[PDB]
Amino acid sequence: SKIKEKEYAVNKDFHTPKFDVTVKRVVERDKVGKESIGFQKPEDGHVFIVVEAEGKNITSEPMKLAFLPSVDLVDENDNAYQSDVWAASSYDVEKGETSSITKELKPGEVKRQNKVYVINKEKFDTGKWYVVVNNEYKEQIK
Ligand SMILES: [Cl-]
Incomplete structure (x- = not known):
């Protein structure tokens, strides 16, 4: 139809040993x-699936960004998707998240970790989907 975006609220915080990872929402859209x-557009029959997430260092020492837990979009067949780093970058500027990130998070510091995937629309629209955090939590979004 004329519907350009469909939103799936998660709004849950997931605890890992070094970081609390918050998943805010998953958004299905036509562009970033x-x-x-x-603007970037996905090719015919595909959509951008954006997973908005953030991690907070809950330890008393700085921790490396490299240790942030994984946050993956996963389908009902257990395929985990890899984020499109360019689209994610465009989406980040789109949201005013324009600043080079640091290599470590300080104690209590929060770091945005938005992921952007290019998915077949029919597959996304007709199947069950999940967000998997640290290969430890599985949250069904649809
Ligand atoms: Cl905690």
Whole structure:
């Protein structure tokens, strides 16, 4: 139809030894970016699936960004998807998240970890989908 975006609220925090990972929402959309920096569109029959997430260092020492837990979009056949780093970057600027990130998070510091996937729309729309955190939690979004 004329519906450009469909949203799935999660709004849950998941505890891992070093980080509390919050998953805010998953968004199905036709494009990412800003008019100033240009827009990106997925190719025919595909959509961008955006998983908005963030991690908070809950230890008393700085921890490396490399240790942030994995957050993956997973289908009913257990295929876990790899984020499109370019689309994710456009989506980040789109949201005003424009600042190089640091290599470590400080104690109590929060770091955005938005993922953007390019998925077949029919597959996304007709199947069951989940967000898997640290290969430890499985949250069904649809
Ligand atoms: Cl805690």
